[PDB]
Design a protein that fits this description.
- The chain is 12% helix and 29% strand.
- It is α+β, with helices and mostly antiparallel strands and 164 residues long.
- Strands 3-4-6-5-7-2-1-8 form an 8-stranded antiparallel beta sheet.
- A hairpin with a 2-residue loop joins β1 and β2 (15-24).
- 39% of the residues are buried.
């Protein structure tokens, strides 16, 4: 499963909505894809399973990946507390891209976002590393439950995850 697609099973407000499947850009940013993939498999004994999406901004993005503090304050990578920006080869040109959340240059951890629009203002600032290939309806349904402020009253949970 070295370059296998990744799935999340998603529940919203405790009800199962189905699965999101991602194709990761191993051919552009392998180190960044590896991180996401192995956090999804949980093979190191920690990772995305049971984490939630803590920020959802309609017409912008869904953000998640904080499996340590579960509120946007945490996350860690398979490489340690953080890792470098691999490259900015792929730009934010279409909805449904995976891109690393960060706190400045070279501060990638485990938090990620799924865009719901092109976000070219993030180009050269956030590392794009994959795309949703199944479950865009779930992405849109989650998106519809956020707010301009980014806060949401929906519990959007990754109930299981790994490779397919």
């Amino acid at each position: 499963s070295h370059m296998a697609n990744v799935f999340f099973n998603i529940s919203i407000n405790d009800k199962p909505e189905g699965r999101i499947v991602f194709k990761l850009y191993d051919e552009a940013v392998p180190k960044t894809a590896k991180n996401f993939r192995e956090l999804a498999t949980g093979q190191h004994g920690f990772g995305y399973k049971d984490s939630i999406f803590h920020r959802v901004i309609p017409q912008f993005m869904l953000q998640g990946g904080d499996f340590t503090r579960h509120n946007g304050t945490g996350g860690k990578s398979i490489y340690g507390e953080k890792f470098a920006d691999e490259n900015f080869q792929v730009k934010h040109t279409k909805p449904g891209l995976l891109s690393m959340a960060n706190a400045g240059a070279n501060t990638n951890g485990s938090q990620f976002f799924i865009t719901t629009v092109p976000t070219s203002w993030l180009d050269g600032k956030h590392v794009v590393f994959g795309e949703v290939i199944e479950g865009l309806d779930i992405v849109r349904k989650v998106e519809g439950k956020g707010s301009a402020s980014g806060k949401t009253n929906a519990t959007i949970k990754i109930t299981d995850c790994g490779t397919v």
